[PDB]
Symmetry: C5
Subunit: 386 residues, 5 copies
């Protein structure tokens, strides 16, 4: 006679009105069951506050007019047809920026009761209120809000293909090799309503993810700690007014190097910044300050009575800063030497200064390094808590 | 029988001439109501002088031919049909650069009188004349001018869906997490005309936004304040003939260093610049002049190159100004040695008068560098007040 | 009866053959009037030698078939129809790189005689031979050459909607708030031809613009002037070698720091260089040569009087240019004098030393001349820029 | 009569139903033979973990309706027809990111029994789990998983055009002038089943490649080696800071500078570092600690008047290492005594120096060990790279 | 009666089967004459190894069905119709990356025998193996290979419109205001055959271009040459430890200031780099070493030189090296003579001087030698670039 698969298509698509919502009673809405499966997390631009992700999307609805009796058409039950030849809902995402990378699937499946199945990928670029308060130990929940732009709930309601529990624990396909880990895909339904006349169906998808901080645990924290811990020694083991300048220039050498390479690495939003960057500049600042101080006093007392103890108005301020922390010719010729190498007139003034002042920068550098070590474990715990 | 939507869709679109303006009297125009809702502010490139936005746009007009009696078609009043099957106006934005990200909504709603509704989003890239004069405390009104490119006022007028007051105080959806803040979306109608023959409709939308300057407040102002105050104790502690040079070149590095981290943070435009950068280099300018003038006095008079340095004609010209603002033969040889120990001991000349004039200028720049820091602090708060006023 | 617009569109588009050039005598061409209005200048990439602009474009031509009597259609004279339903010429810009930002206006107006007006925008990206020989004060003459790619003069000639004088002075819409300024849009017609058989029409629009130099005048020229004069006071009043060399090198650093912070915003193209960069490196070069000669003699002759009285040949040449520039007591006195022995010893060489030091003021004289030319060159650029 | 191609195309496309899968018994699937030919490797971003490539793709299937007896149509056996007029499978790649640079081929060949050969290029952008643990001597096998997005194995199975041996040894076209080298294209068939109801066909293509490490061998390894040896000789001869510290930190500058220059040379990812970057920071870190203890030694032994006496509980631990690792008259010369005392200087910490100075010799053993293993890895990396 | 174009366009396109190769005897091929005219070189990315160019393309073939007698249509011989209404071959460029910038021309010309003509532009982005060994004096031949993707030689052969001599030298349109100069566009026909069954046509176009090095010579060579010879003065005339440092310091600033500004300027490919980058780092490093070796000497000659008297084995080493290259009275005087010991430290330093001195007549010998080759290359590169 003729192939059933041609005998069926012409029976359906002929007298089919694409563009019309496929129902007989307009009062009845057509429902769309949704399924979302993550596949990858391509990029996270913390500056532009967006998220590039690749998911495997599918949905099904019902078409009253795409029905047939299989027994006539060689007992065929399923069928594939072009997607441009039938009605399709205007489902989208609210949180989108760019789209067009997602190709167009030119086919969909149909069953003899009107169930239409449409599979597709989605290269999405969404917006997300990202946070980098804890940069390496960062956790974020970005949302994908599926809905129809035009049709209301009286025409299009949205539901789920599967159970929610199957949607949360769905690691059946996901690239764990990337920077980010997947924890959950938590959905939620809502009846969106911005005004009175109309309401709209929404189906959210809270995409929770977690960073893999090990790379950053090494390249940042150990160098910072290895330098932070060693800058401490430059205050205590050696004396103020000494060659400890040699100890700090070399520290600052690698320290600035560390700041340079990492500034190329960690993000920099205008909305905020992480805390570890706050501790680096501090521990950089005091190093320069103590170094800028240490070079002065060796150079001040290097000379004898060249400038006498002029600024003795601030030693009053020093007073409780202590408390806060805690041959008759040959006669004169030979006497000219002990007169020469006596070093009390300017030294003692600016020396007691440098010592007591040194304990300040030391005692402060201790805590900036302390909090840097204290806060680090909390972010790990929170990162580990999830 | 058959269903209603099929009986209705064929009733309308059959013998429907898409491309024709949908009226019976051509003398009558076709108005289009408008509504705009700001969803987000995605990017503000102060260099290229553009703006990126996401808008939830809707409009409606009337189609005299898309009319029916609902009672025949099962009392159906509403309907959804494809957008490419009917006439649509050529509403566009003059202040546009890029389009293509905004997708196409294929469907539109229709009522039994002709009211066509078209909801859609708009990912826009507009051109806007910005100003970073008051860089952190910036406020900018960028305009969105909706109009038809071809059709005139006689064919297409433009109107508002809602009241203008509702449009301004519209924050039902907006991302307050982003860098910028929203204040108003002020509309305004105009009858644009550029020649004599034709006049065109316009409906503007002045989008007023405000920056969240807190992050920039600590990263640039506190450092700039930090460098400024310590430069000024550097004036009083050392007098001229001393270790000023110990401290100026110390801190001239700080301005030089700090001035780098702003050049990448601060948006590097070309039409203009903010005022803080002016105060940064102006404060650096004195930190050179106060340093250079200090060099020519101090290590010079100590060097004793000039035994008669003082110009009295010019020192007078200086002091004209300051007044307006304010064995026996061996028994001697030790004393001979002591003359050569006094050589080894110290030095002094008549340069103290010449050198006194070096002192007073340093204490005069104290009256200047202090001044520049003053206006830098005074100008700061009025910007905050303005930004706070909006 | 029935509406007129609906009754009319069937009268025209039915039996209408899109794709065919709309004339009755093929021997006659189809003229296309043109008009251009600038609206903004979006970007000028001196590196890639391109120009990004946004103009407002319109054109009209005559379609012999789109003709009707308005009396039979309710006295209606004008009509709007889609552009995809009619013939449209293949007008294009030759100096283009990328197009596609321009959206498509579907509708066009039609009159009862055949005039087919077509308004549209154009977001162009053209290729322009940009010159930054005079960077802050520069003027450019970029060309927008409109023509059909395929049809010849026998089918399509091109004219102007308006007069050229109106076109040049047209500034009804232009954003004067941007970086660049508009002066003129000069049109010009040509009969393009590259081989013998085929000739093609052309209408070039020479777009002249001008830069707003004030921002660059602040960021570059005053600091360069600022950093230049301090190298002059750092020469004369410190004739010494000790503090001179230090403060001179204190200057050469900030001289270099300024040299790079401008380099990021300075537009560097592989074709040519702006003159104000040429002056910075020359004044850097003399800042070094003056330093080289300075150290070449000082620590070798002055700080250590190593006996080098030999080179008077090397002063003969100098002497030319000076015309063309224009028992215990025995030991007590020993140690007592030994301190005086340890004082300075200005030998005859240190007198020879000073005749080489004379040229230190010659380089001063030359470095001064460089900074002078830096000023004379600037004003003539400002002047000619004012003339445009 | 009439042409054959014209008479033939009517015989087929008339009453043809594009969109229908071209078979008679739906129970039977339709197979798609596949072939892949590499042409170039264009870009490799280790940061974004993607890959850009250019391949020459072809495939064929069968169409039961596109059949004819060639004897009628002038013995014509082959034919070219457009792709838009016939059914086409929905074959794609799972590991895609962006596509659209690849153009569309508007023609397809067809034979007189249903074979439908479709050639096309593909400018792909694919994700790949890369690794730069062995940065210069790096190897990557990236996957190209071809499949249909919708249709199942029951409708569409996938097969190869050629044998896999032909596919692997296919360098008929490839640009060996690029940064990357090609080794193999290893295919593999699979049956994908994420769930129960449905199973899908797959045909992967493991694209194995190899870097050309020569340029990176020069710009990085020779300097790093050149920098490592020079810090070693600084540890043998000079025993104190005025002999040591002035030397080694001069290298710490260039060493640190070298660490900077490699970063902009290196590829920056976030999943894992190379190894050589570890040896650099380590040898840098070790260098710092040597510098650290060296200075504390100097302050107390060589500089101090009275120093921290010897606890020697720690020397008890350090010595265990060696077991494991191995009035006129005087008034005159009172001044001379003052001078003689001014010029002589010594303390007791020489004994306290010994326990400390040998730690220099101790850590010195490590700078060999690290710099040693720096080379040991670098050759097995070369070898395993060479073996591949 | 009726116009001719409407009477003609309906006579052809009615009963015209687009999608069919327009011939009567399928056994014949369909030739496609080709012509290529360069217009501009837009970009040359040495890093990504691509080439952005813009050409003016045209081709003509034969359509046996598009024929008419002009006498029956008002003696009309030519005609413009849409490209979308006729068969168009599948010509493409194999070595492309992305296309789509170029617009589509919706019209083509037709004559009364079948000679279809299709003018259009092309904004190409092709892959090319670019060498930058001779960076400023570069010469590069990139290939543009035109062919049909699907159709074979039996269906589509390719030829030229003009003679190759005309194509080889056609600067009738080209922008000589760019960085690159044009020399030749050499065509070449082949017959591609990757397998046994199918042979495909090809028409290559070797696009040979040349760089304009004048800008780079100023910005790179003269300063590098300038900062290559001033050091020689330091290397030669003063063996002094303090002065030579002060001189070598100043050069490092301008040299480092120079070395940065060139880095962004020149292209930094991964497969290779120009020779000019070699001598720079050499002349950079070798400056620091001399500056680094002097500071060792002065800091030890002055402070404490007799710690290590002189390592005689190293003395022997450098020795053979250059050899193969080539109670009151005198008690009062005792204190005075104590200062006569201050006249000059022990011979330990006089060898420690011989340590550092004799090097500088070698570091001089090598730096000058390195500067030699840097000058020798620059002229032979110029010669080749000039010969081309
Ligand atoms: N090739 C079918 C793979 C697959 C299984 N499940 C899916 C769900 C959605 C989708 O777009 C794709 C898929
Ligand atoms: N999904 C409909 C959300 C919505 C409510 N109001 C709107 C107005 C305009 C628009 O494009 C969209 C909307
Ligand atoms: N909305 C019409 C504005 C307008 C006035 N004149 C024009 C000329 C050309 C054009 O594309 C646009 C315009
Ligand atoms: N406007 C036609 C100019 C022209 C002359 N010759 C050509 C050859 C090819 C082409 O695309 C264009 C042209
Ligand atoms: N022009 C045909 C070249 C060629 C030979 N073999 C191929 C295989 C696939 C393909 O896309 C192209 C080709």
């Amino acid at each position: 006679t003729q192939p059933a698969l041609l005998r069926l298509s012409d029976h359906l698509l002929a007298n089919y009105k694409k563009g019309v919502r496929p129902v007989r009673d307009w009062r009845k809405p057509t429902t769309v069951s949704i399924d979302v499966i993550m596949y990858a997390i391509l990029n996270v631009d913390e500056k532009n506050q967006v998220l590039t992700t690749y998911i495997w999307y599918r949905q099904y609805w019902t078409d009253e007019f795409l029905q047939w009796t299989p027994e006539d058409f060689d007992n065929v039950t399923k069928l594939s047809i072009p997607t441009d030849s039938i009605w399709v809902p205007d489902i989208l995402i609210n949180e989108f920026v760019d789209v067009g990378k997602s190709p167009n699937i030119p086919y969909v499946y149909v069953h003899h009761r009107g169930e239409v199945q449409n599979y597709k990928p989605l290269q999405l670029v969404t917006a997300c209120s990202l946070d980098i308060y804890n940069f390496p130990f960062d956790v974020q929940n970005c949302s994908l809000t599926f809905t129809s732009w035009l049709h209301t709930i009286q025409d299009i309601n949205i539901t789920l293909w599967r159970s929610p529990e199957e949607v949360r624990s769905d690691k059946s396909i996901f690239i764990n090799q990337g920077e980010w880990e997947l924890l959950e895909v938590f959905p939620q339904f809502k009846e969106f309503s911005i005004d009175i006349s109309n309401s709209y169906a929404e189906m959210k998808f809270y995409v929770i993810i977690r960073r893999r901080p090990l790379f950053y645990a090494v390249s940042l924290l150990l160098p910072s700690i290895f330098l932070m811990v060693v800058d401490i020694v430059g205050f205590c083991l050696p004396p103020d007014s000494g060659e400890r300048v040699s100890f700090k220039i070399t520290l600052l050498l690698g320290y600035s190097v560390f700041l340079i390479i990492v500034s190329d690495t960690l993000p920099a939003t205008a909305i905020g910044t992480p805390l570890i960057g706050v501790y680096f500049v501090v521990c950089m600042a005091l190093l320069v300050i103590s170094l800028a101080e240490t070079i002065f006093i060796v150079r001040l007392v290097h000379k004898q009575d060249l400038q006498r103890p002029v600024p003795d108005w601030l030693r009053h301020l020093v007073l409780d800063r202590i408390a806060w922390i805690l041959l008759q010719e040959l006669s004169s010729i030979r006497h000219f030497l002990e007169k020469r190498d006596e070093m009390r007139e300017v030294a003692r003034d600016w020396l007691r200064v440098g010592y007591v002042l040194d304990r300040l920068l030391f005692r402060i550098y201790l805590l900036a390094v302390l909090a840097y070590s204290i806060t680090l474990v909390t972010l790990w715990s929170i990162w580990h808590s999830s």
